[PDB]
UniProtKB/Swiss-Prot annotation:
Taxon lineage: Archaea, Methanobacteriati, Methanobacteriota, Archaeoglobi, Archaeoglobales
CDD domains from the UniProt entry: Piwi-like
Stated role: Might play a role in defense against invading genetic elements, using short nucleic acid sequences as guides to bind complementary target strands, resulting in slicing of the target nucleic acid. Binds nucleic acids with decreasing affinity in the following order; ssDNA, ssRNA, dsDNA, RNA-DNA, RNA-RNA. Association of the 5' seed region of the guide strand (nucleotides 2-7) with AfPiwi increases affinity for the corresponding target strand; the greatest increase in affinity is for guide DNA with target RNA.
Piwi domain residues: 100-377
Binding locations of a divalent metal cation: 144, 398
Protein name per the record: Piwi protein
Disulfide bonds: none
Region PIWI domain: start-end pairs: 153-398
C-alpha cells in the first residue's frame, strides 16, 4: 500500500511521479553516510556536451531528489575502450578518495563490461552506464547508486510489532548443467536487505552442504552485527533453478534452523516456516486480480502478481509451505500473513522506480545470479565478498 520515505512521509505505491515528487519534498528514507562527499564520473574523450548534460543531471538530482548535499563529482578520462586503459582510471579515482564510481562504457564490448563489473564490485560502489542510452534513465540509475552507497531510497510500511521478524531468501542457481552457487540473504519485513552471502561455485553434488553453510554464514554475519536482535519469527523463501532434491533439501533446511537455535542464533522457541517460491506460467484475465491469494491445497498457494512495467497480464507466484513448527490452529492466520508479506515484498525493488512485481527475496538472488553467471561466462574476476563488509551488507547486485 505505501512506501515510507524521509521525514516521516509516505507515498502510494504504483505511481512513480508521486514517488519522485515525494523524494524531492522529503528525501529518501535514509540518506547514505558518505566518507569523501566525492563521486568519480569516468568516461572517454568523446561526447562533451552529452557528458556535461549527464553530469549536470546527476549533480542536480543527487542534491534535489536524494538530498545528498555538497557532493563533488570529479571526472576521469580513459583514452581507449579496453580493460587496461579503463582500470587505470578506476584505480586513479580510488586513490583520490571517492565514495563511488559512475562508469560510462562503450555499447559493443560485453566481455569488457563484465570484466570491469567484477573489478568494480570487488572494489568500490559503482554504477555502470552505456553511451548509446535521459532524465528517466538517470533517475533510475540513481536509485541503484544511492542504495549501493548505503542509502535506503524507501521502505515498505509494515506493522512495528513485526519490526524484528526476519526473512531469509535462500536456495541456489545453476550456472550450467553441473555447477551452481548457493545464496542466503537476510531481509527485514520492510524489504531492506541486511546481509547477503554467496557460496563459491560448486557442483550439484555439493548443493546441500553449501546450502546449510551459506545460511549459517549469513545468520552469523547478521547476529554478530545485531547481537540483541532476537529472532522470534523466521521465514525462509527458497527459490532458484537448483537440484531437484525435494525431501532432502527440506530436511537440510529444517536441520539448519534447528542448528541455529543451538548456536543461540535465533531464539530457542522461534516460530518458523520454510516456503518454496516459484514463478509459474503467465496467464491473462479476460483492481480485483492483484493482491489475490488462491489456495490450491492446505500447503500450496498462488499469488496473482501483475506483469511489471504496464486483459490483465498475470505473472503468478507459486508459494508452497514445505515445513513449519506452527500449531495447526496458528496455521490459517500464519498462512494469510506470510502471503500478505510476500505480496508486499513484490513492491520492493531498488533497481529503479518501477516495481519489479517479484518478491525482493526472490528477485535480488536472480540479480546476483545474472552477474555471477556473466562474470563466469566472460572470464571476469570472481565476486569475492571474503573480507568485504561492504559487499555482505549492500545491494552491490542492483
Ligand atoms: Cl591519467
Ligand atoms: Cl587520473
Ligand atoms: Cl549497474
Ligand atoms: Cl541496471
Ligand atoms: Ni543544494
Ligand atoms: Ni592504488
Ligand atoms: Ni522466546
Ligand atoms: Ni517446490
Ligand atoms: Ni491481509
Amino acid at each position: 500500500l505505501t512506501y515510507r520515505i524521509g521525514n516521516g512521509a509516505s507515498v502510494p505505491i504504483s505511481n512513480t511521479g508521486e514517488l519522485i515528487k515525494g523524494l524531492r519534498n522529503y528525501g529518501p528514507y535514509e540518506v547514505p553516510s558518505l566518507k569523501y562527499n566525492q563521486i568519480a564520473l569516468i568516461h572517454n574523450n568523446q561526447f562533451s556536451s552529452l557528458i556535461n548534460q549527464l553530469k549536470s543531471q546527476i549533480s542536480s538530482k543527487i542534491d534535489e531528489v536524494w538530498h545528498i548535499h555538497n557532493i563533488n563529482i570529479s571526472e576521469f578520462i580513459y583514452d581507449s575502450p579496453h580493460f587496461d586503459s579503463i582500470k587505470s582510471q578506476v584505480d586513479n579515482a580510488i586513490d583520490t578518495g571517492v565514495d563511488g564510481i559512475m562508469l560510462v562504457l562503450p555499447e559493443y564490448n560485453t566481455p569488457l563490461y563484465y570484466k570491469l563489473k567484477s573489478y568494480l564490485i570487488n572494489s568500490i560502489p559503482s554504477q555502470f552506464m552505456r553511451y548509446d542510452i535521459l532524465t528517466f534513465y538517470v533517475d533510475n540509475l540513481l536509485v541503484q547508486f544511492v542504495s549501493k552507497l548505503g542509502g535506503k531510497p524507501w521502505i515498505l510500511n509494515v506493522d512495528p510489532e513485526k519490526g524484528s521478524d526476519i526473512i531469509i531468501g535462500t536456495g541456489a542457481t545453476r550456472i550450467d548443467n553441473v555447477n551452481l552457487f548457493c545464496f542466503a540473504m537476510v531481509f527485514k519485513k520492510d524489504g531492506t536487505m541486511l546481509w547477503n552471502e554467496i557460496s563459491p561455485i560448486v557442483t550439484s553434488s555439493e548443493y546441500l552442504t553449501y546450502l546449510k553453510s551459506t545460511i549459517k554464514k549469513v545468520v552469523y554475519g547478521f547476529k554478530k552485527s545485531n547481537p540483541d536482535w532476537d529472532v522470534e519469527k523466521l521465514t525462509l523463501h527458497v527459490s532458484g533453478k537448483r537440484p531437484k532434491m525435494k525431501d532432502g533439501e527440506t530436511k537440510i533446511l529444517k536441520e539448519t534452523v534447528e542448528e541455529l537455535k543451538k548456536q543461540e542464533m535465533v531464539s530457542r522457541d522461534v516460530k518458523y516456516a520454510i516456503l518454496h517460491l516459484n514463478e509459474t506460467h503467465p496467464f491473462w484475465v479476460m483492481h480485483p486480480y492483484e493482491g489475490t491469494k488462491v489456495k490450491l491445497s492446505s500447503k500450496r498457494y498462488l499469488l496473482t502478481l501483475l506483469q511489471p512495467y504496464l486483459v490483465t497480464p498475470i505473472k503468478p507466484l507459486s508459494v508452497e509451505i514445505v515445513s513449519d513448527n506452527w500449531t495447526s490452529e496458528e496455521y490459517y492466520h500464519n498462512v494469510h500473513e506470510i502471503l500478505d508479506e510476500i505480496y508486499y515484498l513484490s513492491k520492493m525493488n531498488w533497481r529503479g522506480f518501477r516495481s519489479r512485481n517479484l518478491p525482493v527475496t526472490v528477485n535480488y538472488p536472480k540479480l546476483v545470479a545474472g552477474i555471477i553467471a556473466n562474470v563466469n561466462r566472460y572470464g571476469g574476476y570472481p565476486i569475492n565478498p571474503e573480507g568485504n563488509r561492504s559487499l555482505q551488507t549492500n545491494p552491490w547486485f542492483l
